[PDB]
């Protein structure tokens, strides 16, 4: 719903995963030229990993299951683990180095 409508409307192919809110679903429906009511009515109830490929790169709009990547190759941001860091016992600090 934040992407510009004109830019989105010119995208060749859409990969609509599970969508929760209604505004985004309405925008996606308004930014597609091949609408099947049965397929587009299933958006808020898609499993984790399913997709609905719509556009000129496929013969028909179709509900697929994207093949999982090989084990050990999974995207992951190495953000700090709050629970693990906070569960550790506290140690005496030294803020002269920080200063």
């Amino acid at each position: 719903s934040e992407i510009d409508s004109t830019i989105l409307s010119q995208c060749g192919t859409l990969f609509a995963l599970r969508m929760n809110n209604s505004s985004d679903r309405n925008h996606v429906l308004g930014a597609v030229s091949d609408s099947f009511e049965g397929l587009m009515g299933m958006l808020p109830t898609l499993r984790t990993g399913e997709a609905i490929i719509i556009g000129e790169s496929v013969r028909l709009p179709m509900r697929t299951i994207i093949s999982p990547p090989p084990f050990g190759r999974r995207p992951d941001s190495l953000d700090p683990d709050v629970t693990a860091k906070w569960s550790n016992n506290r140690v005496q600090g030294d803020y002269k180095e920080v200063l």
Binding site: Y95, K96, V98, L99
Partner: protein, 199 residues
Amino acid sequence: IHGEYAAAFKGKAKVYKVTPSNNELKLSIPYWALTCDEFLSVAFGGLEGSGRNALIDKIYELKLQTLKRQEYEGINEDSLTVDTPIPFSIHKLWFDLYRAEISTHYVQGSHSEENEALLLGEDGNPVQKGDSLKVVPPIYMPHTQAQGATKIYLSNRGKNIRKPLEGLASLLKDPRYEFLFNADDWSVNLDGKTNKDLD
């Protein structure tokens, strides 16, 4: 903001107030820990003319003097910017920048600091030599270089920042800004040395 969480945590959290009563600490934000822009916005009310440049130059000179007097790790005269958190005296800054605007020189033409024409008392001592820690300004002889008496000329180096300096003095004498200008342990002496550091 409303101070309503102090009672929720009886002894499980440190409380930093402005006016402590029994055991709560005191909130203290030293002014030299700020940047140049924030300090100007909070103290002088947002100067925009050449007075801002004059204040920046004075602050930089004071910081350079403080670095010269006191050793600091990894900081030299080449890698010191205005925003470096190095202590500097605000009272000395105000005293210099104000005395360079109202006091009169005893000799015309030049305004050397050694030719200060302070109005002396009957006994010989000056009436008001002025103080730095105290915000009282010194008294000077009237500006009149006519015939008959000695020729005394006004200061020839002052800027047009008398009003912001008066405002800064009023803030300095305000007991509501102690958490900035008169912090408990982070007070800055005349030579730029504090009891403790930012650590």
